[PDB]
């Protein structure tokens, strides 16, 4: 194909050929990450009809893209961990023999890139200055993928450079699975009814076929950053996690970094862009999705965000509820996927301010206030925006040695039973709280271990073991304290006991105070939990009885919880570590 490519990495140069020969594109193109390229690609995408260019008074350099109603997220059921032995995928994952899967996908790939450009998209996960940065190359026939990868990863010339002549990298292959015939006119959003998102842990490879959407197609965002990364983590001494990285800044003038793993729809994005409500506190973000954490030479755990932009859910995002998010998209350079077009070339979505009377919806049809029965924006529609535009981005965001983590937080939605905040008794108890994370639920109480249920690249039980092991072998003075929060406990009339949002900084305050040995906490069966007295309520219009209710550890309710933990633990099967059963036994012993 077109190989006058700017590299002497033979291994790469082979692989590109081998793939081209199988997929039969018209040309191969290597992407460089330049502004100049970005515009070409956006122009080609606007000509194709995939992108609409937004009215540029209102938004610098921003676009709207509408997908086929058939690839719109997801497809965890078409997502596979193809390790050699089935046990090393484990019961949270979909497995298939690797040889059987190669057969299926080599068939699928044969001639799939036909009447289309094959982009070779190199990229770096993590800051770029690192000694041994974690790099990858995504081949894809989708331009939308190229553009989106430019914001979400450090893409192009720089990463290609970091690879040398023989530097290792993750081989990541994508196709939309819609080959053209030589006459044929394309569609705005090519995809297929057949979809596979396949992860090969031992060879550190991702094969994606069939979808052009999100985490099925932008291969760094979950395929690399959690699935392959976690497997790397296992083998190499670190942790790849579904965590926001928050930097909380006290009245003067200390920085505390937190890592928090909530499942999606439970509040990562809010907590990561928290505006504290107590005078003198600031907050800055390093990330709101993925945290890579390693132990420092002395002797702490350091976090880095492997990504380079935000890929947020649009619906419900607004100036009241997330103005930091909003200022970030205002700076433009943004691609909106499946939101609505306003009468004057702007974008809108349910929850945004205004009440436009007419819209063109995400299917391209006319939409009307108090009339059309469907949402104007797709309810999982997205924005894709550079991290560097975020006004509260912490200055250490591009810093390869990371930030020391003081606390690690786990949580989800629980209407009952789980208090607003609980501190772990120790590392091994910490892992068990993570390991047992429950959220209601569905797609009524789902277990979603460290908010990683759909993202583990290997067996859950071994993943827990890995967590225990990194703790056993470290100075417990220097480990992060672990906490378990719940913003969502409800009273008898069904209102929230806790107001949450901004005011969650009160809970973070207690966590800091606890680190600076200056707040109290009762020992309870599930861990240490503050009395209302122990929390800074000054300035808050809320009933102290509500707050104590949020804080209750009720022996009866937790007795009801133990069989659900147990089922879940049985479901984890033969790799369930002793530590976790020990902690389960302990929790049971203290509840009687
Ligand atoms: N009651 C309550 N709801 C919250 C809180 N934080 C987030 N939410 C709700 O959870 C949903 C969005 O959380 P988001 O930050 O988008 O979660 P993410 O999907 O985990 O990033 C919205 O419906 C929010 O209003 C909170 O502290 N209290
Ligand atoms: Mg949930």
In CATH, what number is assigned to the domain containing residue 335? 2.170.8.10
| Cα(569)–Cα(493) distance, integer angstroms | 33
With residue 126 as reference, give the H or E element that holds it: none
530's tokens: 């503050």
Question: Would the CA dihedral through 393, 395, 400, 402 be positive or negative?
Answer: negative
Domain-terminating residue out of 369, 391, 413 = 391
Q: Ligand 2 centroid to 566 CA: how many Å?
A: 20
Residues 6+ apart with CB under 8 A from 150: 31, 33, 38, 156
376's tokens: 């104007």
Q: Ligand 1 centroid to 266 CA: how many Å?
A: 5
Q: Alpha carbon of 76 to those of 177, 276, 400: distances in Å?
A: 18, 36, 32
Nearest in space to 346 (alpha carbons), one of 53, 124, 542, 40: 53
Domain containing residue 98: CATH number: 3.40.449.10
| Cα(150)–Cα(170) distance, integer angstroms | 17
Query: Annotated catalytic sites, by residue?
Result: 266
Residues 6+ apart with CB under 8 A from 560: 417
23's tokens: 């997929």
Buried b (16+ CB within 10 A) or exposed e, 229-241: bbbbbbeeebbbb
Q: What is the atom index within ligand 1 of the atom nearest the CA of 321?
A: 25
Q: Ligand 1 centroid to 500 CA: how many Å?
A: 9
Pairing, β 196-200 against β 154-155: unpaired
CB 82 within 8 A of CB 101: yes
**Ligand positioned closest to the Cα atom of 264:** 1
Nearest in space to 414 (alpha carbons), one of 333, 324, 331, 490: 490
**Ligand positioned closest to the Cα atom of 269:** 1
| Cα(579)–Cα(170) distance, integer angstroms | 33
Q: Are residues 367 and 488 in the same domain?
A: no
Q: Are residues 271 and 384 in the same domain?
A: no
Nearest in space to 243 (alpha carbons), one of 402, 32, 469: 402
* Residue of 242, 266, 540, 550 to mutate, ligand 1, most atoms within 8 A of C-beta: 266
Q: Alpha carbon of 161 to those of 3, 121, 123: distances in Å?
A: 17, 13, 10
**Ligand positioned closest to the Cα atom of 445:** 2
Q: How far is CA 494 from the centre of its chain?
A: 30
From the number of C-beta atoms within 10 Å of its C-beta (0-12, 13-18, 19+), residue 422 rates as buried
Ligand 1 site residues, Cβ closer than 6 angstroms? 262, 264-270, 313, 316, 487-488, 496, 500-501, 504
Phi/psi at 198 (nearest 5 deg)? -125, 140
159's tokens: 């990463």
Q: Are residues 347 and 320 in the same domain?
A: yes
Q: Are residues 419 and 470 in the same domain?
A: yes
CB 93 within 8 A of CB 456: yes
Q: Are residues 126 and 242 in the same domain?
A: no
CB 503 within 8 A of CB 430: no
Domain-terminating residue out of 237, 265, 291 = 237
Residues 6+ apart with CB under 8 A from 373: none
Strands (E), 358-402: 358-360, 366-368, 382-386
Domain-terminating residue out of 344, 369, 391 = 391
| Cα(451)–Cα(293) distance, integer angstroms | 16
Q: What is the atom index within ligand 1 of the atom nearest the CA of 265?
A: 19
Q: Ligand 2 centroid to 443 CA: how many Å?
A: 9
| Cα(410)–Cα(436) distance, integer angstroms | 10
Altogether, the residues listed in the chain come to a count of 592
Q: Are residues 452 and 418 in the same domain?
A: yes
| Cα(442)–Cα(415) distance, integer angstroms | 14
Residue 209, classed as helix, strand or coil, is strand
Nearest in space to 147 (alpha carbons), one of 347, 289, 341, 335: 335
Nearest CA to ligand 1 atom 8: 267
Angle between the N-to-C axes of helices 555-571 and 578-591, in degrees from 0 to 180, rounded to the nearest 10: 160
| Cα(356)–Cα(469) distance, integer angstroms | 55
**Ligand positioned closest to the Cα atom of 315:** 1
The tally of CA atoms less than 13 A away on the side-chain side of residue 108 is: 24
Nearest in space to 196 (alpha carbons), one of 117, 311, 96, 327: 96
* Residue of 214, 267, 412 to mutate, ligand 1, most atoms within 8 A of C-beta: 267
584's tokens: 């389960």
Using CA atoms in the order 32, 33, 36, 40, what is the torsion angle rounded to 10 degrees?
Answer: 90
Residues lying with their CB under 5 A of ligand 2, a single-atom ion: 263, 439
DSSP 436: T
Calculate ∠ Cα 517-520-523, nearest 5°: 115
Please tell me the total count of domains within the chain: 3
Q: Ligand 1 centroid to 126 CA: how many Å?
A: 27
DSSP 414: -
Q: What is the atom index within ligand 1 of the atom nearest the CA of 317?
A: 16
Q: What is the atom index within ligand 1 of the atom nearest the CA of 504?
A: 27
Pairing, β 196-200 against β 309-313: unpaired
Other Cβ atoms closer than 10 A to 186: 13
With residue 347 as reference, give the H or E element that holds it: strand 347-348
Q: Are residues 355 and 450 in the same domain?
A: no
Using CA atoms in the order 72, 33, 455, 264, what is the torsion angle rounded to 10 degrees?
Answer: -60
Q: How far is CA 381 from the centre of its chain?
A: 15
Q: What is the Cα Rg of the chain in Å?
A: 24
Residues 6+ apart with CB under 8 A from 466: 233, 234, 239
Q: What is the atom index within ligand 1 of the atom nearest the CA of 272?
A: 15
Q: Are residues 81 and 32 in the same domain?
A: yes
Nearest in space to 259 (alpha carbons), one of 247, 243, 274: 243
Nearest in space to 452 (alpha carbons), one of 469, 464, 470, 465: 464
Nearest CA to ligand 1 atom 13: 267
Q: Ligand 1 centroid to 113 CA: how many Å?
A: 40
CB 459 within 8 A of CB 87: yes
Peptide bond into 441 cis (omega under 30): yes
Q: Ligand 2 centroid to 413 CA: how many Å?
A: 6
DSSP 12-51: HHHHHHHHHHHH--SEEEE----HHHHHHHHHHHHHHTSE
Residue 166, classed as helix, strand or coil, is coil
Structural domain range at position 456: 238-307+392-592
With residue 549 as reference, give the H or E element that holds it: helix 544-550
Q: Are residues 459 and 319 in the same domain?
A: no
From the number of C-beta atoms within 10 Å of its C-beta (0-12, 13-18, 19+), residue 490 rates as middle
Q: Are residues 403 and 435 in the same domain?
A: yes
Q: What is the atom index within ligand 1 of the atom nearest the CA of 262?
A: 20
| Cα(584)–Cα(590) distance, integer angstroms | 10
162's tokens: 């970091």
Q: Ligand 1 centroid to 112 CA: how many Å?
A: 40
Q: Ligand 2 centroid to 422 CA: how many Å?
A: 19
| Cα(71)–Cα(79) distance, integer angstroms | 14
Q: Are residues 184 and 109 in the same domain?
A: yes
Buried b (16+ CB within 10 A) or exposed e, 289-318: bbbbbbbeeeebbbbbbbbbbbbbbbbebe
Q: What is the atom index within ligand 1 of the atom nearest the CA of 288?
A: 21
Residue 404, classed as helix, strand or coil, is strand
| Cα(364)–Cα(360) distance, integer angstroms | 6
**Ligand positioned closest to the Cα atom of 414:** 2
Nearest CA to ligand 1 atom 22: 265
Q: Are residues 380 and 422 in the same domain?
A: no
| Cα(435)–Cα(94) distance, integer angstroms | 19
412's tokens: 């989800």
Other Cβ atoms closer than 10 A to 55: 14
Domain containing residue 437: CATH number: 3.90.228.20
| Cα(123)–Cα(12) distance, integer angstroms | 13
518's tokens: 């200056």
């Amino acid at each position: 194909g077109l190989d006058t490519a700017p590299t002497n990495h033979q291994g790469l140069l082979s692989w590109v050929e081998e793939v081209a020969e199988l997929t039969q594109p018209d040309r191969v193109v290597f992407t460089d990450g330049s502004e100049e390229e970005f515009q070409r690609l956006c122009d080609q995408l606007v000509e194709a009809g995939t992108f609409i260019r937004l009215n540029p008074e209102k938004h610098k350099n921003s676009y709207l893209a509408l997908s086929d109603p058939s690839d719109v997220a997801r497809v965890e059921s078409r997502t596979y961990i193809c390790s050699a032995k089935e046990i090393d995928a484990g019961p949270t994952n979909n497995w298939m023999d690797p040889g059987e899967m190669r057969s299926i996908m080599k068939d699928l790939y044969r001639g799939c890139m036909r009447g289309r450009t094959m982009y070779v998209v190199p990229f770096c996960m993590g800051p770029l200055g690192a000694e041994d940065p974690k790099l990858g190359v995504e081949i894809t026939d989708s331009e939308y993928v190229v553009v989106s990868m430019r914001t979400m990863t450090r893409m192009g010339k720089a990463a290609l450079e970091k690879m040398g002549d023989d530097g290792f990298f993750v081989k990541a292959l994508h196709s939309v699975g819609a080959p053209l015939e030589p006459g044929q006119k394309d569609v705005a959003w090519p995809c297929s009814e057949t979809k596979y998102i396949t992860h090969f842990p031992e060879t550190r490879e991702i094969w994606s076929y069939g979808s052009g959407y999100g985490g099925n197609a932008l291969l760094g965002k979950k395929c690399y950053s959690l699935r392959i990364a976690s497997a790397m983590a296992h083998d190499e001494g670190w942790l790849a996690e579904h965590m926001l990285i928050l930097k909380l800044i006290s009245p003067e003038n200390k920085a505390y970094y937190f890592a928090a793993a909530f499942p999606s729809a439970c509040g990562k994005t809010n907590l990561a862009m928290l505006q504290p409500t107590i005078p003198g506190w600031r907050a800055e973000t390093l990330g709101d999705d993925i945290a890579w954490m390693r132990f420092g030479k002395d002797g702490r755990l350091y976090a880095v965000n492997p990504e380079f932009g935000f890929f947020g859910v649009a619906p419900g995002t607004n100036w009241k509820s997330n103005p930091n998010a909003m200022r970030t998209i205002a700076a433009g350079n943004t691609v909106f996927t499946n939101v609505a077009l306003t009468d004057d070339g702007d974008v809108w979505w349910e929850g945004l301010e205004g009440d436009p009377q007419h819209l063109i919806d995400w299917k391209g049809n006319d939409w009307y206030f108090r009339e059309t029965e469907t949402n104007a924006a797709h309810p999982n529609s997205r924005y894709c925006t550079p991290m560097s535009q975020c006004p509260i981005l912490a200055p250490e965001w591009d810093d390869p040695q990371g930030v020391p983590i003081s606390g690690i937080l786990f949580g989800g939605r629980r209407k009952t039973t789980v208090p607003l905040v609980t501190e772990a008794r120790d590392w091994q108890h910490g892992v068990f709280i993570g390991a047992t994370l429950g959220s209601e639920q569905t797609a009524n109480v789902r277990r979603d271990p460290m908010a990683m249920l759909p993202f583990l690249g290997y067996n859950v039980g071994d993943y827990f073991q890995h967590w225990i092991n990194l703790g056993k072998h470290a100075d417990e003075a220097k480990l992060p304290k672990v906490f378990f929060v719940n913003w969502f406990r409800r009273g008898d009339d069904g209102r929230f006991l806790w107001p949450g949002f901004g005011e969650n900084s009160r809970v973070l305050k207690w966590i800091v105070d606890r680190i600076e040995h200056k707040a109290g906490g009762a020992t309870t069966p599930i861990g240490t939990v503050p009395a209302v007295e122990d929390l800074d309520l000054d300035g808050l219009d809320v009933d102290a009885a509500d707050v104590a209710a949020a804080l209750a550890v009720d022996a009866d309710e937790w007795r009801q919880e133990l069989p659900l933990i147990e089922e879940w633990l049985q479901f984890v099967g033969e790799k369930l570590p002793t530590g976790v059963k020990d902690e389960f036994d302990a929790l049971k012993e203290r509840l009687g």
